[PDB]
Write a protein that binds this ligand. Structure first.
Ligand SMILES: *[C@@H]1O[C@H](CO)[C@@H](O[C@@H]2O[C@H](CO)[C@@H](O[C@@H]3O[C@H](CO)[C@@H](O)[C@H](O)[C@@H]3O)[C@H](O)[C@H]2NC(C)=O)[C@H](O)[C@H]1NC(C)=O
Ligand SMILES: *[C@@H]1O[C@H](CO)[C@@H](O[C@@H]2O[C@H](CO)[C@@H](O[C@@H]3O[C@H](CO)[C@@H](O)[C@H](O)[C@@H]3O)[C@H](O)[C@H]2NC(C)=O)[C@H](O)[C@H]1NC(C)=O
Ligand SMILES: *[C@@H]1O[C@H](CO)[C@@H](O[C@@H]2O[C@H](CO)[C@@H](O)[C@H](O)[C@H]2NC(C)=O)[C@H](O)[C@H]1NC(C)=O
Ligand SMILES: *[C@@H]1O[C@H](CO)[C@@H](O[C@@H]2O[C@H](CO)[C@@H](O)[C@H](O)[C@H]2NC(C)=O)[C@H](O)[C@H]1NC(C)=O
Ligand SMILES: *[C@@H]1O[C@H](CO)[C@@H](O[C@@H]2O[C@H](CO)[C@@H](O)[C@H](O)[C@H]2NC(C)=O)[C@H](O)[C@H]1NC(C)=O
Ligand SMILES: *[C@@H]1O[C@H](CO)[C@@H](O[C@@H]2O[C@H](CO)[C@@H](O)[C@H](O)[C@H]2NC(C)=O)[C@H](O)[C@H]1NC(C)=O
Ligand SMILES: *[C@@H]1O[C@H](CO)[C@@H](O[C@@H]2O[C@H](CO)[C@@H](O)[C@H](O)[C@H]2NC(C)=O)[C@H](O)[C@H]1NC(C)=O
Ligand SMILES: *[C@@H]1O[C@H](CO)[C@@H](O[C@@H]2O[C@H](CO)[C@@H](O)[C@H](O)[C@H]2NC(C)=O)[C@H](O)[C@H]1NC(C)=O
Ligand SMILES: *[C@@H]1O[C@H](CO)[C@@H](O)[C@H](O)[C@H]1NC(C)=O
Ligand SMILES: *[C@@H]1O[C@H](CO)[C@@H](O)[C@H](O)[C@H]1NC(C)=O
Ligand SMILES: *[C@@H]1O[C@H](CO)[C@@H](O)[C@H](O)[C@H]1NC(C)=O
Ligand SMILES: *[C@@H]1O[C@H](CO)[C@@H](O)[C@H](O)[C@H]1NC(C)=O
Ligand SMILES: *[C@@H]1O[C@H](CO)[C@@H](O)[C@H](O)[C@H]1NC(C)=O
Ligand SMILES: *[C@@H]1O[C@H](CO)[C@@H](O)[C@H](O)[C@H]1NC(C)=O
Ligand SMILES: *[C@@H]1O[C@H](CO)[C@@H](O)[C@H](O)[C@H]1NC(C)=O
Ligand SMILES: *[C@@H]1O[C@H](CO)[C@@H](O)[C@H](O)[C@H]1NC(C)=O
Lengths: 271, 100, 204, 204, 291
């Protein structure tokens, strides 16, 4: 609001606790974004590890398992996803969990779901061969267990050909990841709107406080400086309100993603 | 006094419940007043004003326009002993910090 | 300076595909054109032919006037109360001429600093007299070829005189030029990595 | 661990501080001379009192607007939470949900509601497996020249004998006809092993 | 103050390539971040010196008094006894230990602080214990035992219904001020209707959460159901409001300047009776009475 101005700083205290509510609201969103990731990826407390690189039942998980060749320790699909997705008092805070730890959580969930099925969602991870693991999933959808055993070579081929097509599906047509890029686009455009309203002309002779304080009478220009304080405080209020609305939206999306993880990944769903 | 004191002042309470509380900010400003204007070159012709020997009479005082130049009024203390120096318009000394 | 960004500003710009007067070359085609909020000047003279510009409202030694003669060696910018008749000309005799004007009242400003499609933009706002310039070579037929040529600031001197008309004088013993009128519009300028403008977009 | 009930404590604290901040802005001095109105109308002239008090109205009207907006956002959040709580009630207390991690950590059996100030607390009775033992498994069993598959269970081996037990609990059962299916020959199953299959109808 | 352009920042030798007429440089945010000297044609970059909300890492005054600061977003070279450069900013007052533990106090990207032998220490949080699943194409594990675990989940249901008087809060028992409030239009009508909507919404939320049963069910005299003890959730007549011990603990653990608080439509006794009915139904009828 002021930008290293003593006359504006002492005058801003007369507006009450409006600055306190904005900081409390922005900190409530910051602790919300860290809690959202803690509810989606941080499902299991035991970091399971995949066995040495081999075959389970003919299913090729080379596209989703982490490879030690790259230093980022990210799977090819995660790498393809990542490869296509401070000024004026605005400071962006780093998330509590980094991309390396999120990758570790994903790898643990994957090693639990390919070596133990859904058993690691209710308690200890129980060993089970992946051939007969998927056979239990056929019995859940109303198909006998013998169909998978008599078509195991065909199920593995259709699965490996489908996982391989996921890379080509998410690589081309960049509009597929538009739902996830729109978040950072909205954040960036909101920051740009907040930083561009600083040079507004809400009714003062200029947008810079130095051009007004040096030209007009300091004891008289108070009523005109207050016209810029209201213009800059309402912009901050609008920004905080939009951030709270988008935070509620992201919280709904994160709860949906957590339910998806707990039901589709940590188990088998009939919904 | 100390970070704990301003932390207490931010929460408005003498107690702390083991959190990371945003309290204040930080800045730095040790120096200022770097180079402002380029090479002063086109000086105002005060040489043909205060050093010209041939002055016209008082009944026929000369009229010389001074414009489009930098008026270095410090040379007035050189071409004359500044006996009757008196500025009735703006200021005797505060003359180089304003423009016309 | 702007590097690989798109900037839109509401300023006096020449509208795209607008109506611009042309003078296809003792034939000089000097009808004493008027002067709106902005004049876009462009010419394709052979060699040092169109090197004269005058400005002013009444020009009868009552208001301030401009006289920009290139003299083939400099840019002689002088502001004074010149007396322009119904037809100025620069019929030299060398490189000297006086029949352009006949009087000089105040002459409060002088500027003699140093300087084949040549383009210029002459703007007057808030007392200043903005001057832009750009020289780009052409080899095709004379048809004002399509493309883009951003004009660079040249002088930008503060005068503060009143200007409502302007006239161009040529030296005698091709000569074709263009006169465009700037209008309040909104463009979309694209700057390159070195600050050079690549293309513009008229939002209307 | 007072942070356990922090979900409702935060609600009541936000309900308290929203009213305390709203009344604290009443004693503010937004670009005015005094925070109270009696010291303004009885000290300043009416032509200036209406202008000075107008800025106090905008400051207090903005506080009410902010309060109402924050209350609407918190009401939307609490409405989402209450819809979640009602769905959880209907799907955990009034029945048995197969959704994992929806009615507790593990296999949900039943739930009990408990009333709380401005909220609800669920008690999720979950079934958690523990104390597991490793065994050798096979996809099928070949006894009468044809493959056998368990109806509801898994095939386990303790080293020398084979048995069929529940998938989630250890209960060894003798492989019989009423516990296994029959489909296909012993050539398309990858990993089928030999074992005897009892039949209670043959001896009788 | 280059040619009048006032500001504050660092000036470093820039590698930009301006044009002969350009003097300043702007970004997409309309901020001057590059400038040239008026005397020498050298180009300089303008970067913000330092700013960031210092978060004082505190282990609670009830335990100790030692604190640690976190200059977020700046190096340790531009600050005025342990100093460690975390990727979230300069941390002063806590040394970095190589051992990994659970994240107690969030400090930044992967760094968390805790009060452990005392002094404050920072470290890389551990996501969990390593468990190598001994997978094999013929290995299976079947549980031989079980454990009945009762977990708790706390979810808010309703807010505190409030309603504020517009004129009494803005002006307050005034006439010259209330006349100016009429010039602001019907903004007072919007807030009152919004608050009434919030109140009826909280009432509807309470109704949808707790009043799902059509009837009120009660349990017979307490006997040996199957060996299960519901005394912690069943209400007792020896205590008013008919709340269970768990509900008692929940209730125990958890002027008017023109604003008033509206009482809930369903008091604490009606919600307690609804909860008791739900419990009595789910212990004697199961999922049958819900259908
Ligand atoms: C503004 O004035 C300064 C100071 O006079 C100018 O800086 C000087 O510019 C000259 C011409 O480019 C530089 O070249 C030569 O340097 C040698 C010494 O190596 C000297 O003997 C020559 O006489 C000549 O000055 C010179 O190094 C440079 N000096 C400094 C300290 O910067 C500057 O060019 C002027 N700028 C304009 C726009 O007029
Ligand atoms: C510009 O055009 C003029 C004539 O139209 C060319 O002749 C030059 O005119 C200038 C003044 O317009 C002469 O400069 C004069 O020098 C004397 C000292 O000798 C000085 O007292 C005057 O005040 C004035 O500055 C210049 O001598 C004259 N050149 C010749 C050869 O006679 C001129 O060449 C054209 N170009 C330029 C760059 O002036
Ligand atoms: C699984 O499929 C991949 C390609 O669809 C096969 O090729 C491997 O691709 C990964 C990158 O995803 C490389 O790191 C490997 O070096 C590739 N291996 C070979 C032999 O080219 C991969 O071989 C398949 N896995 C199996 C077990 O067949
Ligand atoms: C540019 O303006 C000129 C006149 O200012 C236009 O010429 C006129 O064109 C109309 C046909 O639309 C004729 O009826 C008139 O007689 C013309 N006037 C003159 C003086 O020639 C010209 O059409 C305009 N061009 C564009 C592209 O708008
Ligand atoms: C922007 O400026 C740079 C620096 O002058 C230009 O890079 C030069 O390009 C030419 C032509 O390709 C090369 O011969 C030079 O070697 C390049 N300079 C360097 C230092 O490598 C660049 O071309 C300019 N951009 C545009 C669009 O003209
Ligand atoms: C695997 O299980 C079988 C089945 O219980 C075990 O065989 C039993 O061994 C006991 C010990 O002498 C006998 O009393 C039973 O009559 C046997 N029953 C059958 C059906 O054979 C066998 O010992 C177990 N093996 C291991 C290594 O635990
Ligand atoms: C035990 O299992 C083996 C392997 O499946 C059986 O061996 C097969 O027997 C069939 C018919 O007797 C032959 O057609 C196959 O060629 C045999 N395969 C191999 C690899 O030998 C065996 O018959 C089963 N029973 C016994 C008693 O060994
Ligand atoms: C169900 O559990 C409660 C406590 O969890 C039991 O209440 C306690 O009973 C003992 C008698 O063995 C008394 O000494 C305690 O004072 C009681 N505590 C409370 C808080 O009431 C209750 O008896 C249990 N139900 C049954 C049927 O045994
Ligand atoms: C004044 O002019 C004379 C020549 O007329 C010159 O010698 C002298 O240096 C100039 N300056 C002063 C201070 O006399
Ligand atoms: C002076 O400039 C104004 C433009 O603001 C113009 O309207 C007016 O006609 C000019 N004066 C003369 C004498 O032309
Ligand atoms: C379980 O694992 C242990 C250790 O590898 C092994 O000795 C034992 O035989 C296994 N149990 C069975 C039934 O194979
Ligand atoms: C299991 O895997 C091992 C090692 O890859 C292999 O030797 C063995 O034949 C496999 N068993 C079956 C039944 O495929
Ligand atoms: C923390 O607070 C409790 C309760 O007031 C108190 O008993 C305890 O002594 C405190 N901790 C220390 C280290 O004094
Ligand atoms: C200083 O700040 C820069 C800018 O981000 C950073 O790259 C660097 O790691 C920091 N620390 C040191 C020692 O340079
Ligand atoms: C199963 O676990 C419970 C509790 O851990 C224990 O009381 C019981 O004895 C165990 N049963 C067996 C067969 O190990
Ligand atoms: C059923 O409950 C009654 C009353 O508590 C008890 O006397 C009876 O023994 C119970 N039945 C069984 C089979 O335990």
């Amino acid at each position: 609001i002021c930008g290293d101005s003593t006359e504006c700083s002492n005058l801003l205290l007369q507006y009450g606790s409006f600055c306190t509510q904005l900081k409390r609201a922005l900190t409530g969103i910051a602790v919300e974004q860290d809690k959202n990731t803690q509810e989606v990826f941080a499902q299991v407390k035991q970091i399971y590890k995949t066995p040495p690189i081999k075959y389970f039942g003919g299913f090729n998980f080379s596209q989703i398992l982490p490879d030690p060749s790259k230093p980022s320790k990210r799977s090819p699909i995660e790498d393809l996803l990542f490869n296509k997705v401070k000024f004026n008092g605005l400071t962006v805070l780093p998330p509590l969990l980094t991309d390396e730890m999120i990758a570790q959580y994903t790898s643990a969930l994957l090693a639990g779901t390919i070596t133990s099925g859904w058993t690691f969602g209710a308690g200890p991870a129980l060993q089970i061969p992946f051939p007969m693991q998927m056979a239990y999933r056929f019995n859940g959808i109303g198909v006998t267990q013998n169909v998978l055993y008599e078509n195991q070579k065909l199920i593995a081929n259709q699965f490996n050909s489908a996982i391989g097509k996921i890379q080509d599906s998410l690589s081309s047509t960049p509009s597929a990841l538009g739902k996830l890029q729109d978040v950072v686009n909205h954040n960036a455009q909101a920051l740009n709107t907040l930083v561009k309203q600083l040079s507004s002309k809400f009714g003062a002779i200029s947008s810079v406080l130095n051009d007004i304080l040096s030209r007009l009478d300091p004891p008289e220009a108070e009523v005109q400086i207050d016209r810029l304080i209201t213009g800059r405080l309402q912009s901050l209020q609008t920004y905080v309100t939009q951030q709270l609305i988008r935070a509620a939206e992201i919280r709904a999306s994160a709860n949906l993603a957590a339910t998806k993880m707990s039901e589709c990944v940590l188990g088998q769903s009939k919904r | 006094l100390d970070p704990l004191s301003e932390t207490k002042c931010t929460l408005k309470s003498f107690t702390v419940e083991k959190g990371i509380y945003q309290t204040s900010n930080f800045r730095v400003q040790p120096t200022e007043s770097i180079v402002r204007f380029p090479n002063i070159t086109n000086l105002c012709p005060f040489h043909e004003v205060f050093n010209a020997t041939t002055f016209a009479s008082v009944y026929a005082w000369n009229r010389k326009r001074i414009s489009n130049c930098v008026a270095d009024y410090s040379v007035i203390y050189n071409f004359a002993p500044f006996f009757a120096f008196k500025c009735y318009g703006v200021s005797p000394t505060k003359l180089n910090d304003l423009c016309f | 300076f702007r590097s690989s960004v798109l900037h839109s500003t509401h300023d006096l710009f020449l509208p795209f595909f607008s109506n611009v007067t042309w003078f296809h070359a003792k034939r000089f085609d000097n009808p004493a054109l008027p002067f709106n909020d902005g004049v876009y000047f462009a010419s394709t003279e052979k060699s040092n032919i169109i090197r004269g510009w005058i400005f002013g409202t009444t020009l009868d030694s009552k208001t301030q006037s401009l006289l920009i003669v290139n003299n083939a060696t400099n840019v002689v910018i002088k502001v004074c109360e010149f007396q322009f008749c119904n037809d100025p000309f620069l019929d030299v005799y060398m490189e000297s001429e006086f029949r352009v004007y006949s009087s000089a009242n105040n002459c409060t400003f002088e500027y003699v600093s140093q300087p084949n499609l040549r383009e210029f933009v002459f703007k007057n706002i808030d007392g200043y007299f903005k001057i832009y310039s750009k020289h780009t070579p052409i080899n095709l037929e004379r048809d004002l070829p399509q493309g883009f040529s951003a004009l660079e600031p040249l002088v930008d001197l503060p005068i503060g005189i009143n200007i409502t008309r302007f006239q161009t004088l040529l030296a005698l013993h091709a000569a074709a030029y263009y006169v465009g009128y700037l209008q309040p519009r909104t463009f979309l300028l694209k700057y390159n990595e070195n600050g050079t403008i690549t293309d513009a977009v008229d939002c209307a | 661990t007072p942070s356990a009930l922090g979900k409702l404590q935060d609600v009541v604290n936000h309900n308290a501080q929203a009213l305390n901040t709203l009344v604290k802005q009443l004693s503010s001095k937004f670009g005015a001379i005094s925070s109270v109105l009696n010291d303004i109308l009885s000290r300043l002239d009416p032509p200036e009192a209406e202008v000075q008090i107008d800025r106090l109205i905008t400051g207090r009207l903005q506080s009410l607007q902010t309060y109402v907006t924050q209350q609407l956002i918190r009401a939307a959040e609490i409405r989402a939470s209450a819809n979640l709580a009602a769905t959880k009630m209907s799907e955990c207390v009034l029945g048995q949900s197969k959704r994992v991690d929806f009615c507790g950590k593990g296999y949900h059996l039943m739930s009990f509601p408990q009333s709380a100030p401005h909220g609800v607390v669920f008690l999720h009775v979950t079934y958690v497996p523990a104390q597991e033992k490793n065994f050798t498994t096979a996809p099928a069993i070949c006894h009468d020249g044809k493959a056998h598959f368990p109806r509801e269970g898994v095939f386990v081996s303790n080293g020398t004998h084979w048995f069929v037990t529940q998938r989630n609990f250890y209960e060894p059962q003798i492989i019989t006809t009423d516990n296994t299916f029959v489909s296909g020959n012993c050539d398309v199953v990858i990993g089928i092993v030999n074992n005897t299959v009892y039949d209670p109808l043959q001896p009788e | 103050n280059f040619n009048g352009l006032t500001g504050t920042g660092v000036l470093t030798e820039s590698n930009k390539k301006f044009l002969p007429f350009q003097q300043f440089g702007r970004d997409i945010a309309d901020t001057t971040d590059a400038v040239r000297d008026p005397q020498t044609l050298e180009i300089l970059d303008i970067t913000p010196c330092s700013f960031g909300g210092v978060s004082v890492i505190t282990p609670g005054t009830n335990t100790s008094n030692q604190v640690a600061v976190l200059y977020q977003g700046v190096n340790c070279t531009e600050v005025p006894s342990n100093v460690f450069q975390t990727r979230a900013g300069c941390l002063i007052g806590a040394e970095y230990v190589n051992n990994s533990y659970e994240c107690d106090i969030p400090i930044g990207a992967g760094i968390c602080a805790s009060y452990q032998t005392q002094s404050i220490i920072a470290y890389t949080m551990s996501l969990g214990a390593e468990n190598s699943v001994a997978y094999s194409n013929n290995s299976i594990a079947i549980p031989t035992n079980f454990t009945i675990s009762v977990t708790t989940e706390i979810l808010p249901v309703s807010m505190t219904k409030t309603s504020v008087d517009c004129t009494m809060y803005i002006c307050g028992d005034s006439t010259e001020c209330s006349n100016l409030l009429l010039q602001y239009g019907s903004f007072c009508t919007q807030l009152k209707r919004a608050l009434t909507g919030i109140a009826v919404e909280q009432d509807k939320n309470t109704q949808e959460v707790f009043a799902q049963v059509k009837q009120i069910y009660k349990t017979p005299p307490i006997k040996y159901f199957g060996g299960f003890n519901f005394s912690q959730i069943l209400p007792d007549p020896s205590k008013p409001s008919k709340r269970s011990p768990i509900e008692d603990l929940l209730f125990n653990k958890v002027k008017f300047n023109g604003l008033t608080v509206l009482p809930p439509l369903l008091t604490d006794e009606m919600i307690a009776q609804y909860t008791s009915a739900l419990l009595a139904g789910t212990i004697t009828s199961g999922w049958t009475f819900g259908a």
